């Protein structure tokens, strides 16, 4: 029970598909391009996460600030509750003070 | 990334291998065998 009885379908990786072969190209776009662009401008993703990092409370606060006016009501309500929950957790509970 | 244990079967047999000559349910049921194998060692 719990362990598969046949080998899984073999996994073939093309180590030289175009995505892998060109990975990292232009990561020095600033230092090699007269700093017209910053490498963070190459990051694609949510508008609230490009070239920025934080813990989960900071991300939720940042997402609420920037796209919160555009969120669906159920999702915005969950985000409000999540911020409140993390607010209590990070400010009032834990081993260290 | 959801990681689940995949070789638990082999972890279990490492105890059960020493319990096979015991009597009763403590020769096959890990919960019981693990305690009697520790005592045996």
């Amino acid at each position: 029970i719990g362990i598969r009885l046949t080998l899984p379908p073999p996994k073939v990786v093309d180590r030289w598909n175009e995505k892998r072969a060109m990975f990292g190209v232009y990561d020095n776009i600033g230092i090699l391009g007269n700093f017209e662009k910053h490498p963070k401008e190459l990051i694609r993703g949510p508008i609230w996460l490009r070239g920025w990092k934080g813990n989960e409370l900071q991300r939720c606060i940042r997402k609420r600030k920037m796209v919160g006016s555009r969120m669906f009501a159920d999702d915005l309500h969950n985000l409000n509750k999540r911020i409140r929950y993390l607010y209590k957790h990070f400010n009032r509970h834990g081993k260290f003070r | 990334l959801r990681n689940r244990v995949t070789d638990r079967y082999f972890r279990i047999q490492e105890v059960l291998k020493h319990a096979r000559h015991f009597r009763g349910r403590k020769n096959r049921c890990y919960r019981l065998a693990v305690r009697t194998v520790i005592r045996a060692f």
Binding site: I3, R4, T6, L7 | T6, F10
Partner: peptide
């Protein structure tokens, strides 16, 4: 179904050892 290969391979080796003990070859 769990991800991975190693335990499945390792379990295959154990099923193969049992078959030999079950049916030892000439």
């Amino acid at each position: 179904v769990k991800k991975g290969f190693r335990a499945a391979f390792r379990f295959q080796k154990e099923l193969e050892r049992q078959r030999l003990l079950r049916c030892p070859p000439p």
